């Protein structure tokens, strides 16, 4: 009668950067299924009545103006280059303002995001590569120069920023139902 480890995901003291978003695989357990809460392809009042093959718990941090991108069929720097959800996504997205946890007076430059990438991310793709991005014709060869920039930047979360620039911790729960046996049942 194992209980699903949701406490470890929502109540984690430190969250991952959006470009290196974390995923917790949850299986073979019983779950008791100012917050941004949007579900897609499935109703929340029905999750306690459904069993799934696997439930994937994706967690990361973005800024407030970027939470609208964590959704199916969305475009933008976060959706295309950091964390993409498929068009037929079945699950829920949860976000809450974490300005009291992830913002420092001198600036919390620890949280990063990808700015440049040659192509768009596939659904659920995680790219932690930090190779010098070639924006021109000449080969960069790991040289930060003209048309050769570093692909990651910092959020620099400060408490004096506006809500659109304040940190938001995001937890994306994917509900998978392939073949296999259904082990994650709500109760």
């Amino acid at each position, epitope marked *: 009668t194992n209980l699903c480890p949701f406490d470890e995901v929502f109540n984690a003291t430190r969250f991952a950067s959006v470009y290196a978003w974390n995923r917790k695989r949850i299986s073979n357990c019983v779950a008791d299924y100012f917050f941004t809460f949007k579900c897609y392809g499935v109703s929340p009042t029905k999750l306690n009545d459904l069993c799934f093959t696997n439930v994937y718990a994706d967690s990361f941090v973005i800024r407030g103006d970027e939470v609208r991108q964590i959704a199916p069929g969305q475009t933008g720097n976060i959706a295309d280059y950091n964390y993409k959800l498929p068009d037929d996504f079945t699950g829920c997205v949860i976000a809450w303002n974490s300005n009291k946890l992830d913002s420092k*007076v*001198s600036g919390n430059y620890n949280y990063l995001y990808r700015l440049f990438r040659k192509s768009n991310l596939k659904p659920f793709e995680r790219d932690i590569s930090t190779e010098i991005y070639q924006a021109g014709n000449k080969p960069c060869n790991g040289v930060a120069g003209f048309n050769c920039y570093f692909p990651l930047r910092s959020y620099s979360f400060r*408490p*004096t*920023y506006g809500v659109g*620039h304040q940190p938001y911790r995001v937890v994306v729960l994917s509900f998978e139902l392939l073949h296999a046996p259904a082990t994650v049942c709500g109760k």
Partner: antibody
Amino acid sequence: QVQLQESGPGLVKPSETLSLTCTVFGGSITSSNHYWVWIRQPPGKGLEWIGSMYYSGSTAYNPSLTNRVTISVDTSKNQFSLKLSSVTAADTAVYYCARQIGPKRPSQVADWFDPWGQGTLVTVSS
Amino acid sequence: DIQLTQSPSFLSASVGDRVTITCRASQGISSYLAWYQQKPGKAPKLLIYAASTLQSGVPSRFSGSGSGTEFTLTISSLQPEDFATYYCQQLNSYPLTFGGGTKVEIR
């Protein structure tokens, strides 16, 4: 019109702990766009920034004051305080509390001080 | 640590004279500078912020200008009440730092 009224003992023996309090008038201390700061001025010398604080807890201290500086906020009394431990004669100064405006956007010009407390001289002596 | 160097340390001008005070930063801080006026026994009073924006309630004879490393505070017509020590402050980087001050004597 926001006002700051500081108070506290003007005499602290060496190795003891300095303690000062600032009471905000004409405005709440739970300001979402301001920091609450302390600044000191040794007699005949310039100004040295001690630290800044957001009402919800976060602080920024001057690395020149090592780990002997603590600022705190009492939202229920509209006050914020300063505690400087292990004081020496080099800590004898007029201490001011002040209000610092914080930025609302990344790379916005802020971080100036207005208004100020009237200043309290603290003399480190036995 | 950003260091601010204020020149001169002292100056003595007549009433009606045009006074100019310089503040030079050890690095370029764009327009992240403020000016303060401190009269004897009083807390410093904000005069200019963002290098050139005059604070509401400051006489128009005060003005700031500059960008990058060198900034100037100008009193177009010095008055007897303008006797004070003026400080610059950088507002770009932590820790927050002030200049050494320019004591302005008056006749």
